[PDB]
Write a protein that binds this DNA or RNA. Structure first.
Lengths: 252, 155, 66, 124
RNA sequence: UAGAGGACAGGGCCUUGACCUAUUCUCAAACUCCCAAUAGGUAAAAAGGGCGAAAUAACUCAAUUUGU
RNA sequence: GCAGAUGUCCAAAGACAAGCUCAAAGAGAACAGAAAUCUCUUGUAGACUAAAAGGGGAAAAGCUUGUUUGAUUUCUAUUU
RNA sequence: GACUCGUUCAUACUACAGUGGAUACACCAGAUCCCAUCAGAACUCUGAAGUUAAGCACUGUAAGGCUUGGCUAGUACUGAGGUGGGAGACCGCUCGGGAACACCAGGUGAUGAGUCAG
């Protein structure tokens, strides 16, 4: 038999477009968006962190029946203007995107002087809730890196220590948000074999980014960013198909 | 002999064709106010917070709102009289109505028209027209388009 | 003796003989047990506004009654 | 062009149909073959197997090299000897049917098929 | 209920079937891709509403001023 | 009247989270067969969901794993 | 041109071919650390040597399907009336309302908010 029968096509029910594309969830989404109906105008702003295979994006989203509205946006590719010309998928890159997003959103809402955030590494503030983005939120993930960066920027999102590196390692959290592990990998790879080190970090070596330079470079970037924000119609279809039939009369 | 909760809903509560799967992810986002008029539609994808057998399709008004519950007042007939009944349902099943959007549009039109009408001091038959007898007029038709009719034979 | 087990005849006519009765539709509906922690605030709201209005009433009454 | 069919999966299959002792011996010999721990079947416990990739796959395939009918339609095959041996080959970009973000299927133009499977086999 | 066409088992290229593609005859209180008339429900403005200020709160919102 | 069923069972078959996706059919691979294990292709439920039947269920309401006992005290508004 | 978050939830789907690769997504190199397994296949992390082959975007099929309109057809059907007809089963008439399947024609989306690139 054939499972691709016309009856099967007739009975098929299409999925939602986003679910078919695999972009969304439509259970976490509705749980995130819906708020208690007892309260009114509760927008329940959602922070959105999406990691591509190249760079991450951080947005602030509000809900509507007409559709989601985006208030503030940040890409990983803005770190060049802040001193980071390479490695925009990095853990520190995600942290910087989160801090950039938080600072721009606060400035645009005019609460910069009212929320200074925190310093370096260890009325109620405005609220946001973190997007999962399908990706399995295991311990030590770039999404939670950006979450910590936003919280340090001045946002408030309820988060535990379970998926922060360690189960709790503040030293490793500092190292990851500062890029220390990248430096250690550079050290180990350089010691073990120079060939692999150069063929891997060719661009880092091109820009001459030393191992003991990454952490200070990211720290300087963080301080700077904190102090400064064609078609065919029916007639042609019939014409061309009748021509195709005329050719197939004597073609094969 | 049997009068259980969901009795006789083999088709009524059944989701319509090619409409299976969870409720639309935007139905949660409707805005409700005390005094609004609302319709009750029993969906089956959601299970808890469910309306009952009789109330499917009825109307009412919003008088009670909780974290997720909505209490609606309905007039249900019983023999010789009508008695108010308060039913608590959930947001998935409840649905904003249209029974008053006509009257709301009429009120908005009144507000935006009779204002200028009063400004000019004109009286209008602002009551709904209910068009009855058409007027009498003259029309044209050439003799080249009059097609006669005649009863048909049998076969 | 066989007994008729049910009927619903004449019931509608009996119902409409007295006319289908309507509920009185009073204005206010009680808030005995509806969604507390909101009417909890609302009662304090009413007490405050009443207190201000009545204290101003007494102030005016005294300044007019000497 | 990178329409080269890199080796994708090798699997060793063991089936005894009895309890341990002999099953443990099969596990022991599979361990001595490849250090990766084996995986069991069902216990309606009656069979085990293991999967491998990479240089190990190349070496074991060459070892098993020592009939062109048993090839499957989609460029897969295998044989026995008390062990088993089975292989799965595919072209690059197979990830798009497995990873979670944009799950979607591969067109038939990218698959391998048996006609190319024999060519690859007798080439290597 | 019958044929049209088509690559697993049985025996002497041949047969038996099963099986697959598109057709055909007729049905279902406990079948439904569809869908009536009847019957059912709600709204059609004054103890109400629309449009801004001024107060109140221990409620909500990042907001004693966001709103309710 | 008709077609049946109930006076039980379950620390998991309850709660939550996370991961995966079922039947079936074909294709292939020692013993190995109509059926035994694995892998591939197709696959809107054709399986599964304690029980009878009827609904609902796909990044789940199903399968596997993890942590757990909200299967707790007291009290309202109410529907059948 | 490209992406992110949405709505509409099949005209958006599916099968088969053709077209498009600077950032774009994406394939892709690797497993020291966070992280996971029987397996770095998946997941996580770090990269950018090679890449339209694939996904993704667009187009094509007397493509299936879907979806509108015509037609099926005032047919089947039915509310009220009838000292209408017919032995009955049923079938007319007045005032009324009104189908579906199959068939034919057309089409394969629209869209909000935000950003990058030139």
């Amino acid at each position: 038999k054939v499972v691709k029968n016309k009856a099967y096509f007739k009975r098929y029910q299409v999925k939602y477009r986003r679910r078919r594309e695999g972009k969304t969830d439509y259970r976490a989404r509705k749980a995130l968006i819906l708020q208690d109906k007892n309260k009114y105008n509760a927008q329940k702003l959602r922070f959105v962190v999406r990691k591509t295979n190249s760079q991450v994006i951080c947005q602030i989203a509000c809900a509507h029946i007409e559709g989601d509205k985006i208030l503030a946006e940040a890409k990983s590719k803005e770190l060049i203007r802040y001193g980071i010309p390479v490695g925009l998928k990095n853990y520190a890159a995600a942290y910087a995107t989160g801090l950039l997003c938080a600072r721009r959103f606060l400035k645009s809402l005019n609460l910069d002087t009212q929320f200074l955030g925190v310093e370096k590494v260890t009325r109620k503030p405005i609220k946001a809730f973190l997007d999962v983005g399908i990706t399995r939120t295991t311990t030590g993930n770039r999404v939670f890196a950006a979450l910590k960066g936003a919280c340090d920027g001045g946002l408030n999102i309820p988060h535990g220590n379970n998926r922060f590196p360690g189960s709790f390692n503040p030293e490793q959290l500092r190292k990851n948000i500062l890029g220390i592990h990248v430096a250690e990998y550079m050290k180990t790879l350089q010691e073990e074999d120079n060939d692999k080190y150069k063929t891997h970090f060719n661009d880092y070596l091109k820009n001459n980014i030393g191992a003991d330079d990454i952490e200070q470079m990211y720290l300087n970037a963080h301080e700077k960013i904190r102090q400064n924000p064609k078609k065919l119609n029916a007639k042609l279809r019939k014409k061309r198909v009748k021509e195709k039939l005329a050719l197939y009369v004597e073609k094969l | 002999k049997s009068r259980g909760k969901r009795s006789g809903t083999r088709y009524k509560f059944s989701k319509k064709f090619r409409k299976h799967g969870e409720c639309t992810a935007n139905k949660y986002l409707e805005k409700l106010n005390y005094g609004d008029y609302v319709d009750i539609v029993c969906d089956s994808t959601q299970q808890k917070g469910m309306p009952f057998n009789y109330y499917h399709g009825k109307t009412g008004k919003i008088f009670h709102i909780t974290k997720r519950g909505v209490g609606v007042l309905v007039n249900k007939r019983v023999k010789h009289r009508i008695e108010q009944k308060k039913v608590c349902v959930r947001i998935e099943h409840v649905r904003k109505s249209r029974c008053n959007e006509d009257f709301l549009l009429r009120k908005i039109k009144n507000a935006e028209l009779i204002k200028e009408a009063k400004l000019k001091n004109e009286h209008i038959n602002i009551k709904r027209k209910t068009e009855g007898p058409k007027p009498a007029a003259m029309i044209k038709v050439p003799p080249s388009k009059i097609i006669t009719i005649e009863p048909l034979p049998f076969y | 003796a066989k007994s008729k087990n049910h009927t619903n005849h004449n019931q509608n006519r009996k119902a409409h003989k007295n006319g289908i009765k309507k509920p009185k539709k009073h204005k206010f509906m009680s808030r005995k047990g509806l969604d507390p922690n909101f009417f909890r605030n609302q009662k304090y709201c009413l007490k405050g506004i009443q207190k201000k209005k009545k204290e101003l009433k007494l102030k005016a009454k005294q300044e007019k009654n000497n | 062009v990178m329409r080269e069919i890199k080796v994708n999966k090798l699997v060793l299959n063991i089936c005894v149909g009895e309890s341990g002792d002999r099953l443990t011996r099969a596990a022991r010999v599979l361990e001595q073959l490849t250090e990766q721990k084996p995986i069991f079947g069902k216990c309606r416990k009656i069979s085990c197997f293991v999967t491998v990739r990479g240089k190990k796959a190349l070496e074991i395939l060459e070892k098993g090299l020592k009939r062109r009918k048993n090839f499957s339609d989609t460029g897969n095959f295998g044989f026995g000897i008390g062990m088993d041996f089975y292989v799965h080959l595919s072209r690059s970009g197979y990830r798009v049917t497995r990873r979670t973000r944009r799950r979607s299927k591969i067109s038939k133009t990218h698959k391998v098929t048996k006609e190319d499977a024999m060519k690859w086999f007798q080439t290597k």
